[PDB]
Amino acid sequence: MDVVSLDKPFMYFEEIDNELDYEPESANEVAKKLPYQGQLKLLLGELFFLSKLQRHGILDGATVVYIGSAPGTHIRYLRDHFYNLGVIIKWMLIDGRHHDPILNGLRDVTLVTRFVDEEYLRSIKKQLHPSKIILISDVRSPSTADLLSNYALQNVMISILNPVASSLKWRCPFPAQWIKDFYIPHGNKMLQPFAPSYSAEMRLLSIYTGENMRLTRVTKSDAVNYEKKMYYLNKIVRNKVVVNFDYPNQEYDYFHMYFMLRTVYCNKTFPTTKAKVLFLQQSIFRFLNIP
Ligand SMILES: Nc1ncnc2c1ncn2[C@@H]1O[C@H](CSCC[C@H](N)C(=O)O)[C@@H](O)[C@H]1O
Numbered sequence: 089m090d091v092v093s094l095d096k097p098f099m100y101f102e103e104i105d106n107e108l109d110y111e112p113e114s115a116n117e118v119a120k121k122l123p124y125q126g127q128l129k130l131l132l133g134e135l136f137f138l139s140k141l142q143r144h145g146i147l148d149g150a151t152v153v154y155i156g157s158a159p160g161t162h163i164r165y166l167r168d169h170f171y172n173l174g175v176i177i178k179w180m181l182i183d184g185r186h187h188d189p190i191l192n193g194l195r196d197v198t199l200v201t202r203f204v205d206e207e208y209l210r211s212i213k214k215q216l217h218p219s220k221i222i223l224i225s226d227v228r229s230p231s232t233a234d235l236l237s238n239y240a241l242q243n244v245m246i247s248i249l250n251p252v253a254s255s256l257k258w259r260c261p262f263p264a265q266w267i268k269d270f271y272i273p274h275g276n277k278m279l280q281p282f283a284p285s286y287s288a289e290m291r292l293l294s295i296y297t298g299e300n301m302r303l304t305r306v307t308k309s310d311a312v313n314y315e316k317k318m319y320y321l322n323k324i325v326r327n328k329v330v331v332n333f334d335y336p337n338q339e340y341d342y343f344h345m346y347f348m349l350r351t352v353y354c355n356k357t358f359p360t361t362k363a364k365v366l367f368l369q370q371s372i373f374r375f376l377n378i379p
């Protein structure tokens with residue numbers, strides 16, 4: 089068995105302290121180990137992001153515009169969680185594909201069947217006025233050309249919608265398929281437990297102050313670093329059993345999940361953080377139909 093003792097998990101990309109040369113053979117390895125693993129990955133990250141905004145007092149009264157929201161099964165859990173806490177939020181889910189019917193019939197959630205473009209963003213901005221906007225993007229076209237187009241669209245989402253905060257899908261093009269340098273919003277690179285086994289994807293979390301929008305250039309040398317840091321995390325770290333983590337599941341991803349869930353607010357008062365987390369995890373897995 090692959091045992092180890094850890095203090096905390098890598099919560100952000102910047103904390104990864106080592107790297108490994110990417111082995112193309114990893115692409116053939118088992119990518120997922122749990123049913124609806126993708127919904128779980130998304131739910132944990134967005135719950136983490138949203139609970140942070142609650143902490144800063146920027147969630148209440150906002151309209152969450154989620155682009156690339158379909159099927160969006162996990163979004164029903166998020167909506168219920170904050171709705172039950174007494175937080176007032178309006179949800180606007182936009183995608184060209186159809187959403188999970190469990191999202192229907194809620195006065196606080198609007199479903200839109202449309203593929204967004206710059207022109208549409210303008211029209212919704214005019215209509216959402218004067219509500220504060222929280223942007224969540226999970227759009228998917230891939231090729232480096234596909235990625236660049238998605239990232240360009242994501243920057244336009246921020247420029248046109250002018251959100252108070254945002255969570256953006258972020259995966260750096262692989263160096264071997266580099267095309268040209270580009271810019272992304274400055275923010276924290278939140279790492280994702282339950283991401284596919286060898287995925288280099290993370291979520292860019294940003295909070296906007298004043299009327300400023302700070303961007304950061306991404307170069308091919310940055311791309312090499314992303315590839316090696318993420319490969320080390322995936323090949324080595326995520327395959328660790330944290331034996332000093334007293335929890336029903338000691339695998340790294342559960343240890344990491346624990347640290348994200350401990351930041352979530354609940355109506356029910358618990359005697360220990362461990363108690364709250366086991367409760368939240370149980371609740372989450374039951375909702376998604378994960379054993
Ligand atoms: N311009 C665009 N506007 C809206 N949705 C888009 C888009 N381009 C791609 N997409 C959507 O991006 C989605 C990627 S999969 C998204 C999964 C979703 N976040 C969930 O929680 O289940 C697809 O449904 C796709 O239709």
Ligand SMILES: C[n+]1cn([C@@H]2O[C@H](CO)[C@@H](O)[C@H]2O)c2nc(N)[nH]c(=O)c21
Pocket residue numbers: 110111112113115262263264286287288315319
């Ligand atoms: C996380 N990952 C997936 N692929 C994908 O796996 C295939 C075989 O190696 C590649 O062709 C690419 O799609 C990666 N490619 C590179 N160069 N680097 C990566 O970190 C990588």
